[PDB]
């Protein structure tokens, strides 16, 4: 029974979040908790307050006409109870639900863990026999108790593009919001755990550069080598596979590059000194001992700056 | 209450994605979101637009016979939501409903990570009393929303096979349509992650062939063969296991074979040159060499021949 | 309202596998996606084609009495819909399903992987006021689409045990039958990614033979001897807590007895020539040379013949 | 509507176990799948065989009262099927569900892997207008299947504690029963996969008194300490965190000491060996050779008796 | 349709806890079974002992208005059974509910495994056209049973905050109440599984301070690092990545610092006595015997007081 009408019927939609959590880098979804809020204009609803009994009536679902509002991005159907449904003198009717969904949205990690993520919750609705237009009633979509937290993420901001996206599909006009959840990873902890001992196991690896015994230096190179694949496990089990490449994607495999020519170096050095050539093994390493922090340091400026500064 | 029919009543089918995700290789299953839409002509239902009321009249699913269509290769029946029904004068109906479901289907690992996929969603009807046939009509079919993405996969198309599998049953026709998406896996991290690495480790297994210390040479062929074992299991775990030979499961195989004979090697070497037989031993050394970058690069195009080029 | 009957009332079962997937090897479960199709005759719903209507009624589940068939071994109650009810003219009703459940079997892993299994689908019903035995009708027990396909296995046959298990529980007679779908492991993959794996690791660790080098013996036999724990940590985590031995179980744990009197030979080796007495040692070496392969493959004729062969 | 009553209800327990499964040793919890079966006195319902129908007429549950019987140490309410309801001629009503639930309770790992368990599932009834007491009854309470089995357990037996404790919580009488299933593990696996291994690497951790090279003891006995840390990780990983001290947590920690002073021996006697102060070294060798062995054999009686046989 | 009012209406709250389970220190959620018990005055209720029957009467809620109480910080909509409704004849309802819900709390990591948390349970209700007000009856607040138990936690008391934050949401008044469940970490099990291995392991990387044996030192202080890096994994993946420093986080990564100096020190060592410096080299060795352990238990009394001592 939708409203009968002269014109787009306007759902005013707000969403206020509750409680925001599972943040799954390798599925890209997140779950969300919320107050969904939508009013709209049924004025076969209209009554008189003196004469009509009191100043709102209130229904249970089954009696109005509701909208059917879907979240484009979801895995499955949004788990709602109904809080309220108000009829408003004029004909206005304010329901509010409270419900939860794991949301879909696709995530960037091109400066994980150095990145930053804007969510998205999309509403549509689609119209039959009278058109539906979604809009945002500011005040209703302020969205967010103080005590929200996403583990593990600073919460920049919830808001909403005020205007929908309106188009067809199947031959029917269907309307859609988006709702934007910007949000900057913590990133923290990720230097003592990871990116701090990564760069200890290299300099171990090549304190190999003060030392003449290739067993010592096999030993060092390879055994550093093998801690960094451990971390290039640890970290690469926790994110998604990417078309692209990550910025400690990137200094990973860096890393791998300045470990095999390290072992090309002991190896060479080990060479030319059984050649009885230590003149030229002992130039050799003299020259790593500067070139390869250095080059490192380089590598990383010219590295940071194409993931960040450009 | 089926609708009393002169012969079989063909239901139209269509599905429009409009969430992919979850692709499970361990599984072979993945999770789809999508329109199911539905039309048939029931004239019980035919009506008058001038004398009764409006143009087209709505029914929710208690009121009309629909057609029961199920999924054959899902782990349990969808989850759907029916988002409209309307009759038009005639006795068309039109069903909409969005669903949800995880479909099983087969994936063929002998090109993985390079490897192609097509899913399949399958949908059968049961026939009662008077045959039903489904079939697609290209409109409501077309299927992915141009944001359907699947994780670590591209989504090159969704189609539908438009002639139907009717076949017998348990004493009842059957009628079987075939939806299907056709993906390519990303292997890009692969390359970064897995392959590079792989190689890394197995020439710095080589650099044993430049000298002429047992210790050290153990000590390289042993850890770089620990690394290896490490990647094939963290390669194996995250893939099914076949009846046949993957890709990159010959691959890795082969590079057991290659550390192995380099084991042998390096022992017959130390063997040699103890049983004061340098001269066999330095020419074994430096024909090796030569010898393992060749029969390696010789094996790889032999076996990516074998694999994609046949 | 049970048909009121002048005997015990034969119910006739079938089930058709549509999908067979998630054997989990741990948990000794599997599941399973089938039609369920009972008959029985309730004379009450009997009919005249002529006076009454048409050929065959149909009816919705509350209309008529319907069995209670419950599957014995399954975790939770079977996700079952409704597909067909069809009475006949004499009161013979055909009752279609399609249900989904996990059923729980117990596997024998004493010739894993290479092993075969019967899986088992028990299904009671419960007597009342009437007796119920279950029975199998042997055409609606064709059990198999030609697409069921249970990953890593093949699938050898579905069949039922044609006489019911009728027996007494909690003062009422039950009927239970017995659907049997037997299965075998695809063994190949295990043998390039496990068996050979640990075959190669221990020949590496028998180059030790051939070297008098202490360090590097130790070196060699401790390295692999790590790689075979990691193989058996690999194999056993993806086993369930076997009361009795597998086979695999057996030849890793062999493996462990040849890596520690590896460790002892070496041992005894570097003393009995830092004794100055490396005349023995050099023999006791020379020796094992021989008797490592000899007693391998020795153990394993005995131990492959006491498993599959007896 | 309670049975009108001039006393306590007694309501009669008995349940009959038809699967077990899942025992989660980190969770502490099991999951079953069984009969309850309640019976009482509601007089309304009597009535005469002659006058009435039949002997004994069937009911489905909204019909009658029936007392609500909650378990109490379990996750969620348990997911039940009503089989069926019988009133006697007399107003006894017999009282028939399948239930499967996931049960909560405690296990002890003081002894593990040799501890044996008491799993407890417990029932309260909660008054109302007349206590409700629950009792057992030993006929329907009687064991599990033939065929019921916990993987990696043996079921010592399945019995019910006959009196009830009743008790207050908050203002009414709540009448709760003790049904307890006792069970054993099964230690056997963990002989070959843990024990074994543990001893052997550790073991050849001892190895390195018959040797006096520096390298190839610091090799070993570090070695050999890895593959310690690799099962402790292994272990510690499948069980829970106890304020309490378990035994293969005692004889793994115990070996973590055995391993230290085995390497402050190892550096003792280099240290003394390169003061040239052979005698003392090697004589400090030779006393461990000995010690070693003792301590830990003598440590482990010890142990052993601390734990089990007491 | 709330009972008709001249003032706020006062729902009387209370929880008793039955189960308590499955605190999850990544996810920062713990999962609760209790009983929810409301009360207030709706007079419509009223009725006369002597006319109608008894004493109270009892409702399905169906039937009569009950308040919808929400839990705040909870994932999905709490399962629940209506235990009981008793109206005494004064209009007073006595409402009780058996629920379970998994709550999130944040959990503060900067002491673990010394770490004590309270956990929160906060109930809103939602004003309409009355004011609600929630308020706690101490006496079915009582909240434990002596069972409860939480695995690894040991549970200090569970109180209600009795006042409740009235505020006002979207133009209504709600009003929210604080239960608090106080646990503290039993830590002992991380002593013998973490802390205590973690030192050993380090003092056998110290060692090398009594070796002169460049290769002996690398072998020994590199496999204790990689021994420590897997300490670290196994430490950070049973926790969350938090924005602060957890005390046993700073302590692994003080070791971390200790292992690259050690490093650093063995290096130079060596080069000093490749360089015919011998007397300070081994003077620096000397001094590094007693500086590495007093600066760690300085560094220890320093952090240990930070974190607990404020
Ligand atoms: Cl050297
Ligand atoms: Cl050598
Ligand atoms: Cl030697
Ligand atoms: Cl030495
Ligand atoms: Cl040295
Ligand atoms: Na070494």
Same mark, same amino acid.
């Given at each position: ?107 960037? =990690? ?7 993520? @804007?969510?998205?919750? /999309? *509403?549509? +609705?689609? #119209?039959?026999?009278? &058109? ?125 590059? =300045? ?7 002991? @190896?060479?050095?080990? /060479? *030319?000194? +059984?050649? #009885?050539?230590?003149? &030229? ?30």
């Amino acid at each position: 029974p939708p409203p009968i009408a002269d014109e787009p019927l306007t759902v005013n939609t707000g969403i206020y979040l509750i409680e925001c959590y599972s943040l799954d880098d390798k599925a890209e979804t997140f779950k969300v908790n919320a107050f969904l809020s939508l009013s709209w204009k049924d004025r076969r609803l209209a009554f008189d307050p003196v004469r009509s009994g009191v100043r709102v009536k209130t229904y249970e679902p089954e009696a109005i006409w509701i909208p059917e509002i879907r979240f484009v991005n979801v895995e499955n159907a949004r788990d709602a109870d109904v809080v309220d449904i108000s009829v408003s003198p004029d004909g206005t009717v304010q329901y509010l639900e409270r419900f939860s969904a794991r949301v879909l949205s696709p995530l960037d =990690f091109r400066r994980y863990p150095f990145d930053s993520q @804007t969510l998205h919750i /999309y *509403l549509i +609705v689609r #119209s039959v026999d009278t &058109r539906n237009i979604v809009l945002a009633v500011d005040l209703e979509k302020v969205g967010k108790n103080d005590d929200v937290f996403l583990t593990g993420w600073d919460i920049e901001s919830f808001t909403a593009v005020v205007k929908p996206a309106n188009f067809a599909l199947e031959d029917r006009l269907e309307s859609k919001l988006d709702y934007q959840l910007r949000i900057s990873r913590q990133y923290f902890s990720y230097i003592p755990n990871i990116i701090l001992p990564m760069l200890f196991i290299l300099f171990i690896s090549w304190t190999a550069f003060w030392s003449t015994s290739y067993i010592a230096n096999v030993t060092l190179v390879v055994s550093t080598l093998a801690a960094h694949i451990a971390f290039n496990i640890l970290v690469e089990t926790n994110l998604p596979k990417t078309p692209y490449m990550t910025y400690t994607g990137a200094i990973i495999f860096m890393i791998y590059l =300045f470990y095999f020519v390290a072992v090309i170096e002991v @190896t060479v050095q080990h /060479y *030319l000194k +059984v050649e #009885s050539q230590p003149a &030229r093994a002992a130039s050799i390493t003299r020259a790593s001992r500067i070139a390869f922090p250095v080059v490192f340091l380089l590598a990383n400026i010219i590295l940071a700056f194409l993931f960040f500064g450009f």
